[PDB]
Write a protein that binds this ligand. Structure first.
Ligand SMILES: CC(=O)N[C@@H]1[C@@H](O[C@H]2O[C@H](CO)[C@H](O[C@H]3O[C@H](CO[C@@H]4O[C@@H](C)[C@H](O)[C@@H](O)[C@H]4O)[C@@H](O)[C@H](O)[C@H]3O)[C@H](O[C@@H]3O[C@H](CO)[C@@H](O)[C@H](O)[C@H]3NC(C)=O)[C@H]2O)[C@H](O)[C@@H](CO[C@H]2O[C@H](CO)[C@@H](O)[C@H](O)[C@H]2O)O[C@@H]1O
Ligand SMILES: CC(=O)N[C@@H]1[C@@H](O[C@H]2O[C@H](CO)[C@H](O[C@H]3O[C@H](CO[C@@H]4O[C@@H](C)[C@H](O)[C@@H](O)[C@H]4O)[C@@H](O)[C@H](O)[C@H]3O)[C@H](O[C@@H]3O[C@H](CO)[C@@H](O)[C@H](O)[C@H]3NC(C)=O)[C@H]2O)[C@H](O)[C@@H](CO[C@H]2O[C@H](CO)[C@@H](O)[C@H](O)[C@H]2O)O[C@@H]1O
Ligand SMILES: CC(=O)N[C@@H]1[C@@H](O[C@H]2O[C@H](CO)[C@H](O[C@H]3O[C@H](CO[C@@H]4O[C@@H](C)[C@H](O)[C@@H](O)[C@H]4O)[C@@H](O)[C@H](O)[C@H]3O)[C@H](O[C@@H]3O[C@H](CO)[C@@H](O)[C@H](O)[C@H]3NC(C)=O)[C@H]2O)[C@H](O)[C@@H](CO[C@H]2O[C@H](CO)[C@@H](O)[C@H](O)[C@H]2O)O[C@@H]1O
Ligand code: NA
Ligand code: NA
Ligand code: NA
Ligand code: NA
Ligand code: NA
Ligand code: NA
Ligand code: NA
Ligand code: NA
Ligand code: NA
Lengths: 597, 597, 597
């Protein structure tokens, strides 16, 4: 009788236990203490209750789903995926997750402690899939929420190396769904061709979702893969920290981004990226504005390390028929970024910041402002013509650069005869240090190439830290660019031998509220009078100049040109020098030309 | 016989076990392996040893205390609070913690792994309480220490929604006490009206205490609550990182602060705050100086995201009869902060930095210096008159601003006819970017309103980035403010149409070691002489000016005014221009006035 | 029969269990569920299988090694070191780790969850040791890898207080070896005299190794200890975050460093250091370049708090017969550092950044560039003569300072008649704020002491924020230092009473591509002519000056000196002033001297 009970599945419920033989402890049964934990092994059995060993020819999916469903029924808990085993998944899930090509359905309060390895079987080759899905409905708009679901451990999700079957397919590791207080910590995602590794939230619905101390390795492998973003953050008060992202595929240099920050109060910090095209998008899509409003604000990209091939941070916002997206209150700081070794134009245009047109190419829908870029480093190798501190390709309502170090081909750039952005409140502080890696490479090129429709309320304070006489100019405005209510200065250091410093092809520096200064060489002639004597410019190009001063020594004994000049209505400069002995003087002098500064 | 033993509480101590049938493993009994872990279930029993189910009508407090006391007796360990259950607490603790309105007494080396939910029963409604207390005595001065106590897990402490009964009451979640190597990680504290969620240390006694990845949600709910600070850090080598703080109550906008950093080598990093009045205090209270000395130094507030209604960082120090507190070596960097949408003056004055008078209102007791504020963003909506980069309300011995972006009503402010602080070593670097949100709102107002007793060894380098002709002046010193050994500059950009740029109501810019420059409009008249000819100012207000130069074009052909001016003893400016044709000239010119720069 | 089986070591394999009595769960045996975890207790037994109690007189080493070896055999897992016990280690390991004075050999996929205490027995007194070793061979070049090995928990590794027996000995806590995806989290290392606490990687071989939330306390205690670096990072894509490091020994002030970052893509963040000589080395040793190439790049030191006695960050690179090491793409940001209270010259020279010669003292082997130092604070007490923002002691190919706050004796320093470094691309932006703690201490001293062989492509923009008339000069170049293609400026603020501002002992400011400006006092005499009249310098020292302007008021009525000057071939300055009444004038005026700026 008793032997039978003991050898039965209830035997453990008949063996008494009391913790450490403490007389004041609960008199329990072994089964009670065992019931305090739960593993996959508890559900990984055949219809007769016999345990089944996982392996390449066993599909563990129904067993893991049964575990999650059961623990869900009790109010939650943590299911362990045991170490020292690989658990293969080999069929699709059913019900609500079928619309998402779901394998496993996550449930609220049911955490997974993944210590072993989860692998995809070749059933998934050339097919879409999303491994873990928190939606409970095919239609995300009619889905319930996922709350308090955490995935963590020292384990591994391995996507089996399979290529995409078709570019239109989607593949994901974890889709938390309409996700509140959910996280992934510690896990290695590897060996795939996927669209995302993790997505958080759904069109603004969700909160407090995080990815921390995870690794993402080799998650693009084919030319079929349309696009890849390793973590898409689509709910507020969420972010990514202390993660490692690496790709080795060539295709990843053209298509892969590490992070999308698409809702307010989101962050990307303390991570290391290598082998990717892009670092992060910081974006408000109107099409995603349902759950948390139409503004992306409080967006933070900080203290990351990257080697990328395209753009580090891309800013944007866009509209739909009924919603307009807005982006503001952004900080990009402390990141050290480089474009990896590559040929010029062999990948998307290299940039630290990109102001990106929308997915249909429009550049007149964006509302981006109050962005602070500060205390970052950027480097691109000397050969990479297509490298810029900022590629400013769509309308910009403000962006502030302070105390960065940029060492690349262009500081500000936009391609001519593409978009003509409207620019407001572009602020480039004199504390931005311009590196010299690209010195001597800039023939035909303008360091600050202002290829815009208009610039207003902007500040460009150019300071070189070494010579580059190859460059056509430090800063150039084409005649088509309006310029008003702006400050544009070129410091003289390392400019003495430059023919052109600042160029205003439409003579826009004449505007009533344009404040500029830059070096120029000017020819002057004096009157013949002995004593105090006026010197006048030969050219009549200076009706806009409020004052000028000498940047050249005077090699003469018998006279000196004026130290300082003002102008005359006919556009000459004029100053008062000194003839110790009389005679008409003729000199060529390097001047600092100033207007309202 | 054997059946009896097996069904007894010692039955598990009679069932042999050897790990994985390994012949070299220990021959143990099931009870030994079970004894490797411990849960609340092991103590949650009646006097007969029968397990009791937790619930709203069961008080789990004595059972949890018995578990902690027992594990403490064995040298420590980790007690799990099981998932899928809510454990209610419904009575006060006894002994040493009674003086602290304690519920549970923490003990050294006994960690709590909280995976379920701990809730307060309505016994606590309208009463004080501190849920977990690490002091062992009613009098903190006679308390022993708490060491090596960690609280962690995916669980929840829920304060039951109860309001305070009286403003003088105190309520806390975790009071570690005189706490060494203690931490809270992962836990959600929610649904209360409390004074603090967590306190670390006691008046400088403690070390290596941290709060990490915790959430604090809705912990103020009534007008009775006197004050709320979510984490009070009162021991050195301690801090808060990667936490989330949110309030929805109106009252929280007026009374709630996220963090107090009150001892040296403490930090607040990588967190997100919404709905609070204040971000952090960085303070040395003399009354708290017993355990770690009288200096708060090495204080770090970094990489946080906040939407607040009052002040982001408040600095201070104060004194007692016998102790003087000092604050120095502070860094505030990388934070992106905004004042949330509100009416002007509807909450405490909005500020990025506040120099706060002591709790009795004194402004002449503080010793604050060597503070660095760098690479932060601040924004306040255009309507919020009461918004400042720094509200400088008490004596300041130094604070350095570099490469911040401030977009609010005032840069520097103090209210006139309140405190008259004594200011030393206020440094505002030209790399601080002043935003334009408040342009056109500043009628009657000074952007830098220097409402102080005295300013010395200070630097204010004003740089606008857009026009605001509504403002009375960029910077103004009342006659009551002494000014010496200081540098005060206003860059000309966007100032051409300003009637007043810098204003010294006591003509303080004349001081021997004052170094200033700013734009002014000046009327000048020349002598009638043809040729080189002097121009003189009509007004005699310029005896302090060392040089001036033209910021205006010359619309004339027949003459030019001087490019550069110096002065004369009677206070006129004078320069040498050029009359091509003779005649008395009269012109109004915008000049850069300079003094010793 | 059945009684015998049940009391046997297989008894638990005969007691059936099914999780929570769920009919769809696996019918298992108690032994199966127990086998899901493993502890030291499972191996801590005598030859008869009887458990042995750990203690000061028991050597736990063979038992722990047996556990690791066994778990390794099953594909890995996590062995717990139980809480509430101290486990002593009292003999050396055997085999592959014997060459490393190894105690325990780590194995791939076998994690240690250390919750108790591991202590060293006095067998190790005066001997070398490395507690945990991941190499499997005496010769690291012939060692296999360690992968997926994590050490974590709330436990403690205690080195027993024993002193080193001889300086040439080595002692370590954890040597992961050729280590891929390995980490230490949560652990306290204490009470030793050791060389390192943790090393990661081996000469570039390894990846994704981290130390997080660990504490290192009192790990130097004797004068025998040659050198100490708490964490040596010798593999890429690895780092240290949120750690606490403290020393109390005097010897630690002279010999101890917290971190070595010696391979690319490595970081040191969010940590607190006290009592150490140095913060971090960022170094490419040619001798260590085998596994990850010859370049250290993407090196990040950020958001740390330190009180040190020598240098905070030391940069270097060096060569071997066949390999040349290079260092580039470094960021040092957000750190708040101070030199602790000490006598001048009582420890290694105090510095925020050191450019360190190699271990044989060579200063002409280094290739260091593209370094960004930004948004840091540094303080040293007024008495510490040996304190510098940068001690630039070996060849430097570039380093950029922006928006730091440095408050110490020197800004730039190198000792004369030591090394004569070759300097390129030293950039000190005007946004670096120079503190006043050392005002009045600088007799005989130059704030920027340019004791170099040559300086090129460099920028020094000096800005004072208070007076220090004790200093000999703001910046001084000895005649032996060449200077070309550089910008050197001293802002006038707080300089009016300085006899020397910038000093060029070799008249190097005359160079064709040197761009300089600084204040000087000049004596001038005019001609006697009434009206517009020239003033000329008495001295002929100004042939290099392109323009000068007045920094002094004019106390005269009857005349004014020129506002602005240029020069003449004989080296005089000349300008045009105004005599209202005739007469030879003689004045002494403070001028801003400018050259090509
Ligand atoms: C790979 C990636 O992330 N790319 C970024 C762009 O994302 C956009 O394209 C993606 C391509 O894969 C996604 O669209 C695709 O997936 C959609 C969502 O799938 C459906 O809904 C899921 C919830 C279900 O599980 C699925 O079964 C499926 O039903 C699908 O509707 C599209 O048809 C398909 O092409 C991506 O869509 C978002 O995905 C997230 C995460 O899964 C999800 O939370 C969202 O709900 C979903 N959004 C929308 C609108 O559906 C889609 O956004 C991204 O647009 C771009 C940003 O840069 C551009 O835009 C900037 C702003 O104008 C501009 O500054 C910049 O210059 C532009 O380049 O960045 C990546 O390219
Ligand atoms: C809510 C909050 O934190 N407010 C900050 C101010 O704190 C000060 O007021 C608090 C109001 O709750 C606390 O005082 C209250 O509690 C005291 C401590 O309780 C006793 O001791 C405990 C150890 C026991 O468990 C309790 O049972 C009880 O016996 C009590 O003595 C007071 O009477 C009561 O009002 C707070 O007190 C500190 O609390 C911490 C954490 O519990 C504890 O470690 C300390 O020991 C205790 N300190 C003292 C001195 O007792 C008390 O400090 C805080 O002052 C303010 C800082 O800003 C102001 O001061 C700046 C410096 O001059 C100035 O720059 C600024 O402008 C000022 O506004 O910030 C919050 O307001
Ligand atoms: C304490 C410390 O870390 N000091 C830093 C300097 O490190 C150099 O000296 C150390 C002194 O302990 C180490 O050398 C010692 O150990 C060597 C390694 O031990 C062998 O190999 C191990 C793998 C085995 O387990 C051991 O059993 C043993 O066989 C040994 O070869 C030496 O003979 C001995 O003195 C340190 O050596 C490195 O150690 C790490 C971690 O263990 C290991 O991964 C490496 O493989 C090993 N490297 C080498 C080359 O062997 C050795 O590097 C460090 O040099 C210094 C940097 O600053 C100087 O150099 C800069 C660049 O030129 C210059 O800018 C600066 O001014 C200089 O001061 O910083 C610390 O001093
Ligand atoms: Na779908
Ligand atoms: Na901005
Ligand atoms: Na246009
Ligand atoms: Na009390
Ligand atoms: Na400071
Ligand atoms: Na006064
Ligand atoms: Na060795
Ligand atoms: Na640099
Ligand atoms: Na030389």
């Amino acid at each position: 009788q008793f032997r039978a009970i003991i050898e039965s599945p209830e035997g453990a419920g008949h063996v008494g236990y009391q913790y450490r033989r403490n007389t004041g402890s609960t008199m329990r049964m072994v089964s009670d203490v065992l019931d305090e934990r739960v593993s996959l092994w508890d559900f990984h059995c055949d219809p007769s209750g016999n345990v089944i060993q996982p392996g390449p020819n066993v599909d563990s999916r129904q067993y893991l789903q049964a575990a999650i469903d059961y623990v869900s029924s009790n109010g939650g808990g943590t299911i362990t995926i045991p170490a020292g085993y690989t658990w293969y998944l080999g069929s699709y899930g059913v019900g609500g997750i079928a619309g998402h090509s779901g394998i496993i359905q996550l449930r609220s309060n049911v955490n997974l402690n993944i210590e072993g390895r989860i692998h995809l079987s070749p059933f998934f080759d050339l097919k879409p899939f999303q491994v873990f899905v928190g939606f409970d409905n095919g239609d995300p708009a009619s889905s319930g929420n996922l709350e308090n679901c955490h995935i963590y451990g020292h384990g591994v999700v391995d996507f089996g190396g399979y290529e995409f079957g078709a570019s239109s397919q989607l593949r994901n590791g974890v889709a938390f769904g309409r996700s509140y207080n959910c996280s992934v910590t510690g896990i290695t995602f590897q060996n795939g061709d996927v669209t995302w590794a993790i997505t958080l939230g759904w069109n603004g619905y969700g909160s407090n979702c995080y990815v921390r101390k995870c690794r993402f390795i080799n998650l693009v492998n084919s030319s079929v893969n349309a696009a890849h973003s390793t973590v898409y953050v689509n709910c507020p008060y969420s972010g990514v920290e202390s993660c490692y992202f690496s790709m080795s595929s060539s295709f990843a240099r053209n298509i892969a981004c590490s992070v999308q920050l698409h809702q307010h109060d989101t962050f990307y910090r303390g991570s290391t990226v290598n082998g990717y095209c892009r670092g992060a998008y910081v974006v408000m899509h109107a099409a995603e504005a349902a759950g948390a409003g139409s503004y992306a604000y409080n967006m933070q990209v900080e203290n990351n390390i990257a080697v990328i091939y395209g753009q580090f941070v891309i800013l944007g916002s866009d509209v739909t028929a009924t919603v307009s997206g807005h982006l503001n209150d952004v900080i990009v700081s402390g990141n050290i970024v480089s474009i990896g070794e590559r040929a010029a134009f062999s990948a998307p245009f290299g940039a630290f910041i990109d102001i990106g047109p929308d997915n249909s190419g429009a550049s007149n829908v964006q509302d981006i402002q109050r962005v602070l870029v500060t205390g970052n480093s950027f480097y691109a190798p000397a050969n990479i013509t297509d490298s810029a501190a900022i590629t400013l390709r769509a309308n910009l309502n403000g962006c502030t650069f302070i105390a960065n170090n940029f060492d690349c081909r262009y500081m500000v750039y936009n391609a001519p005869g593409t978009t003509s952005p409207v620019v407001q409140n572009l602020v480039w502080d004199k504390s931005n240090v311009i590196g010299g890696t690209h010195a001597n490479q800039r023939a035909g090129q303008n360091l600050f190439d202002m290829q815009f429709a208009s610039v207003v309320n902007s500040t460009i304070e150019v300071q070189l830290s070494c010579e580059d006489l190859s460059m056509f100019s430090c800063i150039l405005f084409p005649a088509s660019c309006q310029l008003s209510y702006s400050k544009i200065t070129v410091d003289s250091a390392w400019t003495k031998s430059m023919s052109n410093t600042a160029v205003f092809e439409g003579n826009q520096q004449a505007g009533a509220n344009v404040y500029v200064s830059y070096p120029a060489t000017v020819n002057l002639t004096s009157y013949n009078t002995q004593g105090a004597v006026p010197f006048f410019s030969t050219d009549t190009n200076y009706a806009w100049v409020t004052s000028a001063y000498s940047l050249s020594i005077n090699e003469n004994l018998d006279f000196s040109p004026p130290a300082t000049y003002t102008n005359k209505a006919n556009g000459q400069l004029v100053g008062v020098g000194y003839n110790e002995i009389g005679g008409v003087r003729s000199v060529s002098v390097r001047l600092m030309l100033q207007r309202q500064v």
